[PDB]
């Protein structure tokens, strides 16, 4: 289950927030590992290895006052118990020993482009690449932002301007990151990429120069599965 994989990271703040959710809380929206649901469990595992466990176990809140409400520093510069999540989680559960990120939706630079018209999941009109002959690259499946299936509450009216969750958060994690089939197909269409690419066989290229190789990573927390 997803929540058991959250509770495996006992030193992380995500299990702390889930334990408070079973029994600060107002500003937060939730963790990224619960918001996104992907049908393709293989592609889910590959994007999970792409993001890294620090970004995907990071909590998202609506405002910046929630960021100032979670952790507060003292006059010396060290983190003590008396901050919000730290005291309210060390009262019952484990402390925060590892780092955790916090992402606030009013400060992100949101997508400002046409959204595919007449669509339910509100996909993004990003430019599909093309080879010199006039055709798409041969193993192109799609941009990785367009795979995540959203809970229909968060599609609109989360931002104070009215933006959704797909065009603020899910753009500013993997912007113009596109999905291929095999790694030789990904190398074959390497000049036509923007920021990175991700192949369904495995193999991760995060920047236009650097690219991972070796084993594929294994992380326990994944995206959830739709029903």
């Amino acid at each position: 289950d997803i929540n058991a994989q959250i509770l495996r990271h006992e030193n992380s703040a995500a299990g702390v927030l889930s334990l408070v959710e079973t029994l600060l809380t107002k500003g937060v929206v939730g963790v990224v590992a619960k918001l996104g649901k992907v049908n393709d469990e293989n592609l889910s595992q590959i994007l999970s290895n792409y993001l890294g466990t620090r970004s995907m176990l990071a909590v998202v809140c609506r405002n910046y006052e929630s960021v100032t409400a979670l952790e507060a520093y003292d006059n010396h510069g060290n983190i003590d118990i008396n901050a919000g999540l730290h005291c309210l989680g060390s009262s019952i559960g484990r402390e925060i020993g590892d780092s955790f990120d916090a992402i606030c939706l009013e400060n992100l630079r949101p997508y400002v482009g046409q959204h595919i018209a007449d669509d339910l999941q509100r996909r993004l009109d990003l430019l599909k690449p093309k080879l010199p002959n006039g055709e798409c690259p041969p193993g192109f499946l799609g941009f990785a932002v367009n795979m995540i299936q959203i809970d229909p509450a968060y599609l609109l009216c989360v931002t104070s301007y009215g933006y959704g969750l797909r065009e603020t958060l899910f753009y500013n994690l993997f912007s113009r990151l596109q999905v291929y089939k095999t790694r030789a197909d990904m190398i074959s269409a390497l000049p036509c990429i923007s920021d990175g690419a991700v192949s369904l066989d495995g193999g991760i290229i995060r920047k236009t120069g650097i690219f991972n190789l070796g084993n594929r990573d294994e992380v326990n927390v994944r995206f959830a599965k739709p029903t």
Partner: protein
């Protein structure tokens, strides 16, 4: 003198650059972020080197871009990649067919390491 040697090198380079043909079918759409990145992806797709003057111009467009608030806006959304691709091929046609050797001689006299803009892509 040194100027005669560098003028001979300029005439060699211009006679090589005149003969490289512009490709026939150029239907393509590459997502890009800067001008130099488009010229690198455009040399990797189409196996031809761009001119010296074209690499200088394609760098100074980005140096002219640096300052303002457009630097955080994606350049893929400002100018269209088919429009930018056609722009760089038209400037490349001008730079292969039109220039002279004395202009190249002066621009290579003004600075050393002029080979940073000349490409090793031979065919």
């Amino acid at each position: 003198a040194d100027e005669g040697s560098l003028l001979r090198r300029a005439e060699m380079y211009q006679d090589y650059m005149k003969q490289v043909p512009i490709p026939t079918n150029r239907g393509s759409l590459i997502p890009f972020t800067s001008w130099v990145g488009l010229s690198i992806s455009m040399k990797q797709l189409y196996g031809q080197p761009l001119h010296y003057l074209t690499n200088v111009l394609l760098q100074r467009w980005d140096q002219s871009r640096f300052g303002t608030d457009s630097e955080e806006q994606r350049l893929d959304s400002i100018i269209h990649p088919t429009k930018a691709e056609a722009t760089i091929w038209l400037v490349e046609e001008i730079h292969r067919l039109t220039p002279s050797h004395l202009h190249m001689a002066l621009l290579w006299r003004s600075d050393p390491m002029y080979h940073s803009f000349i490409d090793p892509i031979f065919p």
